[PDB]
Amino acid sequence: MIKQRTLKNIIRATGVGLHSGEKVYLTLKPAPVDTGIVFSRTDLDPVVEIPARAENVGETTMSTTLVKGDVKVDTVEHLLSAMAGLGIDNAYVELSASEVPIMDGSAGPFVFLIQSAGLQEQEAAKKFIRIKREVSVEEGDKRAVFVPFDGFKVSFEIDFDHPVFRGRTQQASVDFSSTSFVKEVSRARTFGFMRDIEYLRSQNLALGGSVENAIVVDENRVLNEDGLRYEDEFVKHKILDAIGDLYLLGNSLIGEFRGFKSGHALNNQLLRTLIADKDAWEVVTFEDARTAPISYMRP
Numbered sequence: 001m002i003k004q005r006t007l008k009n010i011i012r013a014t015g016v017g018l019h020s021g022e023k024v025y026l027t028l029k030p031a032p033v034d035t036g037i038v039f040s041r042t043d044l045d046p047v048v049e050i051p052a053r054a055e056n057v058g059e060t061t062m063s064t065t066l067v068k069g070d071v072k073v074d075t076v077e078h079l080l081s082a083m084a085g086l087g088i089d090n091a092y093v094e095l096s097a098s099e100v101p102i103m104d105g106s107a108g109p110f111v112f113l114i115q116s117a118g119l120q121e122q123e124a125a126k127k128f129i130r131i132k133r134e135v136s137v138e139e140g141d142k143r144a145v146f147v148p149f150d151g152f153k154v155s156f157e158i159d160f161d162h163p164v165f166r167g168r169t170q171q172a173s174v175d176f177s178s179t180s181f182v183k184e185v186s187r188a189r190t191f192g193f194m195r196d197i198e199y200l201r202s203q204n205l206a207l208g209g210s211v212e213n214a215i216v217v218d219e220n221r222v223l224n225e226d227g228l229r230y231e232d233e234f235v236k237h238k239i240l241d242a243i244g245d246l247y248l249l250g251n252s253l254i255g256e257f258r259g260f261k262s263g264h265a266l267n268n269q270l271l272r273t274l275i276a277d278k279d280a281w282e283v284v285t286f287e288d289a290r291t292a293p294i295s296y297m298r299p
C-alpha cells in the first residue's frame with residue numbers, strides 16, 4: 001505494497017468563503033512522498049504554508065482553522081474530508097484568500113475535481129495510525145471516542161430539538177471499507193438555522209452563505225427548493241466534518257470514531273489526547289494490500 005498517493009495533475013477551482021464572503025482561487029498541486037497536506041496563502045508576500053496537522057489548529061468555534069503567526073486558513077474540514085475519502089497522502093493546497101471555497105457546502109465538488117485529475121501512487125509505503133486502545137473525551141453532554149477496529153468506521157449521533165431534525169434520522173454509522181465515502185457521504189452539505197444566520201451576518205460571519213452552498217432551515221422546514229440529498233443529510237455532514245478533522249492526525253486511521261453531539265473543538269481534543277497517549281496507537285505499513293484491513297479505489 002500500500003503506497004502513498006498524490007494527484008496526477010494540478011486542479012484549479014474558484015468559489016466563495018462560507019464565513020468571509022471572499023472570492024478565492026484554489027489550486028491543488030501534486031506533492032512529494034511524506035509532504036502531507038500543506039495549505040499555502042499565495043496572496044501574501046512571502047507565501048505562508050501551514051501543514052494541516054493537529055498542532056496548527058486555531059482556537060475555532062464554527063469551522064476548522066489552521067494558524068501560523070496571525071495568518072489563518074479557515075474552513076479546511078470539507079477539502080481534507082475529500083482528500084481523506086480518496087486516500088491522498090501528499091498535496092499542496094494554494095489559496096488567494098484566508099478561507100477554502102465552500103463550493104456547494106459538501107465535499108462532492110472536491111472529490112470530483114480530484115478524481116478528474118486522477119491520482120498518482122508514489123514509491124513509498126503509506127503509513128497508517130492503528131488505534132490500539134479506546135480513547136474518549138467528554139465535556140458536558142458531548143462525547144468523542146476512538147475504538148480499535150480492523151478498518152475505518154465513523155458513527156455519529158446528533159440531537160437538535162427542531163421539527164426538521166426530530167422527524168429525520170439523527171444517527172448514522174458508515175464502514176468505509178464496505179460503503180462508498182463518494183456515494184454515501186461526500187454530497188452531504190453544511191446546514192444553518194435562519195435565526196442564527198440573521199445574528200452571524202450582524203457579526204460579519206456566514207457572509208458567503210446561500211441555498212447554493214448550505215441547507216437553510218427555519219422554524220419548521222428546509223427552505224432549499226430542491227430539499228435534501230439524503231434523508232439523514234445533517235448527521236451525514238457531521239461524519240464528513242469528522243473525517244476532515246481526523247485527517248489533521250497527518251496519517252490515515254485504522255480504527256472507529258464515535259461522535260455524540262461532538263464538534264470541531266471536541267474532535268480536536270480527541271486528536272490531541274490520542275497523539276499524547278502513545279500506548280493507545282502505533283504507526284503500521286502493509287507489504288500486502290490483499291490482506292490489509294483497508295483498501296483503495298484504483299489510482
Ligand SMILES: CC(C)C(=O)N1C[C@H](NC(=O)[C@@H]2C[C@@H](O)CN2)C[C@@H]1C(=O)NCc1ccc(C#CC#CC2CC2)cc1
Pocket residue numbers: 018062063075077189190191192193197200206208209210211214216237241
Ligand atoms: C447548528 C450549528 C451550530 C451546528 O452544529 N452545525 C454543525 C455543522 N457544521 C459544519 O457543517 C461545519 C461548520 C461550517 O463552517 C462548515 N463545516 C453545520 C452547523 C454549522 O456550524 N453551520 C455553520 C453555518 C453554515 C451555513 C450557514 C449559512 C447560511 C446562509 C444563508 C443565506 C440564505 C440566508 C451559516 C452557518
Ligand SMILES: [Zn+2]
Pocket residue numbers: 077078190237241
Ligand atoms: Zn461542514
